[PDB]
Amino acid sequence: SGTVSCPICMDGYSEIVQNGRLIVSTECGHVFCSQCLRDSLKNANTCPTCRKKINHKRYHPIYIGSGTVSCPICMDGYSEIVQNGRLIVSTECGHVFCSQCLRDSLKNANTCPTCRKKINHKRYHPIYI
Amino acid sequence: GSGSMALKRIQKELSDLQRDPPAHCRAGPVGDDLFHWQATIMGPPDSAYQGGVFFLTVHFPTDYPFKPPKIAFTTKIYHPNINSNGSIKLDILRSQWSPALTVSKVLLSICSLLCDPNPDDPLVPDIAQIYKSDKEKYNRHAREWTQKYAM
Amino acid sequence: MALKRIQKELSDLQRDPPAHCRAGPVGDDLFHWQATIMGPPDSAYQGGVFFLTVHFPTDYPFKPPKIAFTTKIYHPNINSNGSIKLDILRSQWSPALTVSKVLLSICSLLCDPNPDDPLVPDIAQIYKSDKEKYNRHAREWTQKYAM
Amino acid sequence: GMQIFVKTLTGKTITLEVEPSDTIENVKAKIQDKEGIPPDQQRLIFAGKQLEDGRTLSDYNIQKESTLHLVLRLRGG
Amino acid sequence: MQIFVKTLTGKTITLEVEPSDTIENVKAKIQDKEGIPPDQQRLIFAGKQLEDGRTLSDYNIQKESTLHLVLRLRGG
Ligand SMILES: [Zn+2]
Ligand SMILES: [Zn+2]
Ligand SMILES: [Zn+2]
Ligand SMILES: [Zn+2]
C-alpha cells in the first residue's frame, strides 16, 4: 500500500529499476520484478499470488514514475483511489490510471491517455499493488 | 458531483504551478474563478518571437479534464495557425486532446508550435503563403508584430 | 538471492512477531531454522506446543522449504517421523508464500485433515470410523508429547 | 457497521467493512476486490483454524477489530 | 553524459547519452522508461521541438540539459 514492491525478492521500486529489472504485471493484476516472475515461470506456469495460469506471456511491463502510484488524470493518490471503491488499473501498454478516469476517457476516444495506443474495455485490467 | 472533480484537478494544477514554476509560462485564475485563467507565454529564444510576452485566456469546461481547455491568445501574433481573434487551430486542443495533458504542458506545446507552424492546412492562408513563398518576409513580419504587440 | 530473502523474512519476523508461531535460525545458519506452533484452542490439540525444523534449499524461494515436525502428533497427514504430506510444501508451492504463512497453514491443517488421501491410513480410518476415538487419541498424544 | 483487519499474503493489513451476519464467502468477495485473489484460492484463518464458506462471522465469534489471516488454498494428502 | 527529461506527469528521469546520439535514439531510451512510442513523443528544448534526424550536438544540448516531453501535436 506504500511503495510498489516485489513480493518474491522484496525489493522496492528504486532498488528494482536501479539494477536493470522492470516492474511487471500479470493479467490477473499481480505485480513483480521481471527477474522474479521469469525465474518463477521457469518452475511453474501459475501466478505466485493467485495461481491463475500466466503461461504464454500473460504479463507485461508497467511504467510508474515515483514508486508511489497515482492517477495522472484525476491526480488522486492510491489511498484516495481505493478508499473510494475505485481500482488501480493498467492498460496493456503499461500505463496506470484509476478505473473511473480510464472509463470516462474511453467514452471520448479509444486511445490510451498516456501513449495514444488503441485500447478498449478488454485491453486494461486491475492491478493490486 | 458536477464540476467537483474538475475543480480539484484545476486546483492541483495551480498548486503545482505555484510550487514548481516552469521556465516557459505563468498562469492562474483571473479573479476568484478557478475555471477562468489568464496565462503568459515567452517567445522562444533565437526566433522571430524572442523577447515577446504573449497573453492567453484559458477557460476550463465543466467536464475538464475529459474535455479540453479552451485556449486563445489575447496578444496579437503573426502565425499561420493562429488568427486575429487569437484562435489556435491545434489538434491537441480538439480531436487529439488527452486528459493526461496539463495546462502547463499545453502551454509548452503552444510555445513549440510558434516555430513549427503547419502551412499546409492553415487557419490564416495569407500568412501560410508568405511562409512557403518567402520565409525571410515571414520572419520579418513575425519579428515586427512581436515588437509591436508583445513588448 | 536466497540468503537476502531469508534475512528479509527473519527481519520481518523479528520486527512484527506473529502469535501463532515462533521461527528463527538454529545457530548462525540462516538456512536452518527451528519453529514452534501452538495447538488451536477448542480442539484435541489445545494446550500443545509443537516443534518443527525448517530447511531452506539453495534455490529458495523458487523451491519450497523442507518442514518436518520434531514433536510427535496424531494426524492422518503427518506421520510418526514428523513428515508432513501437504501440497503447498510440494506441487502447490508458491514463491510468494513466506515461512510464517506456511507455518500458519500447517497450524490450519491440524483441525482440517484429509482422510481420503492420507499419509497414515490407520489414523485416517479411525478419523472416518470413530471421530470420538480419533479426538481422544489426538488429545492424549498432545498430553503425552506436546505438553 | 464494524471493521475487521485481514493480514494479506504479503503481511500487510487491510480493513474490511463488515457485519456480523456477513458470510465467509462475502468476506472473501471483499478480499478479492482488494487483493485480486479469487475466493476459491483464499484460505482465511482465525484462532488457528480455517473459516468455512457457508458460515458467518458471528458463528466464529469474530468481532469488531478481530484480525483474520489470509494464506493460499491448501489440502493435506 | 547525463541529461534530464521532464515527463508527461512533470517527473524527471535521467538518460545516459552521447552528443552524437540522434533524437530518435533519445526517444528510444524514453520509450524504454515511459512506454511512449517515439512517434508519439514531441521533445522540446529552449521552446522548440527537436527533429528526429538531428543530434543532441546540433541543438547545443549538453551535460545536464533538461528536455521536456509532451505528446505529438500538429497545427492546422
Ligand atoms: Zn523480485
Ligand atoms: Zn495472479
Ligand atoms: Zn483518476
Ligand atoms: Zn499507453
Q: Within 10 Å of residue B19's Cβ, how many Cβ atoms?
A: 7
Contact B26, B117 (CB under 8 A): no
Contact: chain E with chain D (3+ CB pairs below 8 Å): no
CA-CA-CA-CA torsion for B87, B89, B92, B94, nearest 10 degrees? 80
Nearest CA in chain E to A93: E35
State the structure-solving technique.
X-ray
The answer to whether the Cα torsion of C19, D51, D20, A2 is positive or negative is positive
Whether the CB of D71 is below 8 Å from some CB of chain C: the reply is yes
Contact E7, E31 (CB under 8 A): no
The beta-carbon neighbor of B65 closest among A73, A109, A114 is A73
SS3 E25: helix
Burial class (CB in 10 A: 0-12, 13-18, 19+), B75: middle
CA distance C53 to C69: 7
- Those residues with Cβ within 8 angstroms of residue C33's Cβ, 6 or more apart along the chain or in another chain: C23, C24, C25, C26, C53, C54, C55, C56, C99
- Structural domain count of chain C: 1
The C-alpha cell that represents A89 in the structure block: 488499473
Antiparallel, parallel or unpaired: β D2-7 and C66-69: unpaired
Q: Nearest Cα to C97, choosing from D69, B146, A66, A89?
A: D69
CB contact under 8 A, B112 and E47: yes
Contact E29, A58 (CB under 8 A): no
Type of residue at B127: I
Entry resolution in angstroms?
Answer: 2.2
- Those residues with Cβ within 8 angstroms of residue D68's Cβ, 6 or more apart along the chain or in another chain: D4, D5, D6, D7, D27, D44, D45, D46, D51, D62
Question: Strand pairing partners for D67?
Answer: D5
The C-alpha cell that represents D71 in the structure block: 494464506
Contact B43, B27 (CB under 8 A): no
Q: What is the layout of strands, in order, in the sheet containing A96-98?
A: A96-98, A88-91, A124-126
Most A CBs within 10 Å, among B2, B62, B98, to test the A interface: B98
| Structural domain range at position B67 | 1-151
Helices (H) and strands (E) in chain D, counts: 1, 5
Distance A52 CA to ligand 3 centre (A): 28
CA distance B56 to B39: 5
Contact B116, E48 (CB under 8 A): yes
Chain D neighbors of A30, CB-CB under 8 A: 36
E strand or H helix at B106, and its extent?
Answer: helix B103-114
CB contact under 8 A, E11 and A93: no
Q: Over chain C, what HEC string results?
A: CHHHHHHHHHHHHHHCCCCCEEEEECCCCCCEEEEEEECCCCCCCCCCEEEEEEECCCCCCCCCCEEEECCCCCECCECCCCEECEHHHCCCCCCCCCHHHHHHHHHHHHCCCCCCCCCCHHHHHHHHHCHHHHHHHHHHHHHHHCC
Long-range contacts of B66-70 (CB under 8 A, 24+ apart): B66/A104, B66/A105, B66/A107, B66/A108, B66/B99, B67/A108, B67/B97, B68/B92, B68/B93, B68/B94, B68/B97, B69/B93, B69/B103, B69/B106
CB contact under 8 A, D69 and C104: yes
CA distance A62 to A48: 18
SS3 A18: helix
CA-CA-CA-CA torsion for D38, D40, D45, D51, nearest 10 degrees? 130
Domains and CATH numbers, chain D: 1-77 (3.10.20.90)
CA distance C108 to C130: 22
Q: Is A74 known to sit in a ligand binding site? A: yes
Write the CATH number for B58: 3.10.110.10
CA of B2 to nearest chain E CA: how many angstroms apart? 25
Q: Is A101 known to sit in a ligand binding site? A: yes
CA distance D58 to D63: 8
Q: What angle do CA A44, A49, A51 make, to 5 degrees?
A: 50
Antiparallel, parallel or unpaired: β A88-91 and A124-126: antiparallel
Q: Nearest Cα to C104, choosing from D49, B119, B71, D14?
A: D49
Chain A neighbors of C63, CB-CB under 8 A: 43
CA distance B133 to A56: 57
CA distance B138 to B132: 9
SS3 D24: helix
Sequence ranges of the domains in chain A: 1-129
Burial class (CB in 10 A: 0-12, 13-18, 19+), B90: buried
Please report the DSSP string for A59-79 in residue order: EEE-B-SSSS-B-TTT--BHH
Whether the CB of E71 is below 8 Å from some CB of chain A: the reply is yes
Q: Within 10 Å of residue A66's Cβ, how many Cβ atoms?
A: 13
Most B CBs within 10 Å, among E40, E45, E68, to test the B interface: E68
CB contact under 8 A, D76 and C88: no
Chain A neighbors of B100, CB-CB under 8 A: 72-73, 113-114
Distance of CA B130 to the CA centre of its chain: 22
Contact E35, A94 (CB under 8 A): yes
Which of these CATH numbers, 3.10.350.10, 3.30.40.10, 3.20.19.10, 3.30.70.20, describes A1-129? 3.30.40.10
Neighbours of ion ligand 4 (CB under 5 A): A 91, 93, 95, 112, 114-115, 117
Long-range contacts of E32-35 (CB under 8 A, 24+ apart): E33/A63, E34/A63, E34/A114, E34/A115, E34/E7, E34/E8, E34/E69, E35/A61, E35/A63, E35/A93, E35/A94, E35/A95, E35/A114, E35/A115
Neighbours of ion ligand 3 (CB under 5 A): A 71, 73-74, 98, 101
CB contact under 8 A, E71 and A93: no
